Design a protein around this ligand. Sequence first.
Ligand SMILES: COc1ccc([C@@H](Cc2nnn[nH]2)NC(=O)c2ncnc3[nH]ccc23)cc1
Length: 166
Amino acid sequence: NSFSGYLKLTDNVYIKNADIVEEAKKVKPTVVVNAANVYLKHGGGVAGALNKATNNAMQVESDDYIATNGPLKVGGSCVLSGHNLAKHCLHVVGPNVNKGEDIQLLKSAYENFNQHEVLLAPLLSAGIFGADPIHSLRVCVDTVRTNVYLAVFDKNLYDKLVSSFL
Ligand SMILES: COc1ccc([C@@H](Cc2nnn[nH]2)NC(=O)c2ncnc3[nH]ccc23)cc1
């Protein structure tokens, strides 16, 4: 968990303009969060990038988890191997608001972060899931009580977040 170049927004929320895959390779955190869907199919976005960095080992493990346990619920999570990126990967499902899943479930999604003392994570329900990313950071700040290090890929979004926050 040797994080560098973060800006402290609150007592427990830190932010950096970084690619989460590169941060995971430098820091080797105990937990990296994946922005997953309920069937753990890592087709694009953060999930596709983390899976590609494991050379599809995350997808093969995820398929075995789904065959044995069934899909996750929206707002839910599971802990699987972090492979070469982290000790563990916490796969978290935020609501896809573009598909009618309630925005209220973004709070439930961030509550899964509280099981882990320190996490490297992306913003949840952003990208194709359609939530406003600044709203997602607000929910993160209001819900997560453990130490979260957020990696925001787009510099334009990073600047809007830092301006809206501290
Ligand atoms: C479907 O859920 C999503 C959640 C978040 C996301 C977005 C939110 C975002 N948009 N501009 N910066 N951040 N984040 C990433 O895609 C992302 N973030 C950090 N490192 C990365 N490496 C490769 C991809 C990537 C998309 C989709």
